[PDB]
Amino acid sequence: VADLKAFSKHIYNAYLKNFNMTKKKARSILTGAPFVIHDIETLWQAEKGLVWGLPPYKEISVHVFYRCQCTTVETVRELTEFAKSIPSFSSLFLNDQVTLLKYGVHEAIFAMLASIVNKDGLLVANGSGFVTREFLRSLRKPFSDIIEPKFEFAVKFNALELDDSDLALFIAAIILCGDRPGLMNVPRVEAIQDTILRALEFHLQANHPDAQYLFPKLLQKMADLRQLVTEHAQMMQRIKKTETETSLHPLLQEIYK
């Protein structure tokens, strides 16, 4: 029990050192000024300077998809650094590390997106912008449809009221996932993931003494996130298929390969 506490603490310190944006900072921004991007005009103002090199200009729905890609890429690089500070992650085979990152980053990105989202939209640009969910729904298919299911997931996730300390362990559990295809040392990964999930159960009784069923609720969100990413990867295949003049960042190319 005492090793699990200190393992949780190590994981929470890796999280605080590696993510630019915590849930604690995001909620203080969201509740109080970010500049509101809610239409074409405000988006252009935001690009001039009140908020912020993306493959040469074309049309709003595609410009937005490109900003999503720039953000997602930056969060992969934070996740990669976070994982390297997860105790035994850096002593796994190099190919296992890359495999865990390749198949887990999206699950982690859509878990952590909740932190910066409310029912009305989300923070961008390290909290200096706020893009409304109504504006993102206004984009043309297939861009609007690849966006809205994440808000639907996030708002439900937020009703669980996790804090940073809980998320560090939850995101650690997503990444150290013994089920990813092509792993070399499965029992080792499985063992690390079971340590995290034991530490997570113990940390939840401590931090959320009156919640009920919070731990199995979280195992289910991990399942939901897998389904969310399977659906996302299908939509991304459809974009790559039907939107030929839209490119994808090479780091994301490798991931979806």
Residue 6 binds what, of ligand 89L, its own copies, none (CB under 5 to 8 Å, by partner type)? its own copies
Q: Provide the CA 27 distance to its chain's centre, in angstroms.
A: 16
Is residue 233 within 8 A of residue 256, CB to CB? The reply is yes
The tokens of 217 are what?
């609720």
37 in contact with ligand 89L (CB under 6 A): yes
Of 61-69, 157-165, 196-204, 219-227, which part binds ligand 89L (CB under 6 A)?
61-69
204 in contact with ligand 89L (CB under 6 A): no
Q: Are strands 35-37 and 121-124 parallel, antiparallel or unpaired?
A: unpaired
- Cβ of residue 206: shortest distance to ligand 89L, in angstroms? 30
Q: Is 132 helix (H, G, I), strand (E, B) or coil?
A: strand
124 in contact with ligand 89L (CB under 6 A): yes
Determine if residue 127 is left, alpha or beta; phi over 0 gives left, psi from -120 to 50 gives alpha, anything else beta. left
Q: Which are the residues after which the chain is interrupted (C to N > 2.5 Å)?
A: 32, 52
- Cβ of residue 16: shortest distance to ligand 89L, in angstroms? 19
23 in contact with ligand 89L (CB under 6 A): no
Is residue 107 within 8 A of residue 225, CB to CB? The reply is yes
- Cβ of residue 169: shortest distance to its own copies, in angstroms? 15
147 in contact with ligand 89L (CB under 6 A): yes
171 in contact with ligand 89L (CB under 6 A): no
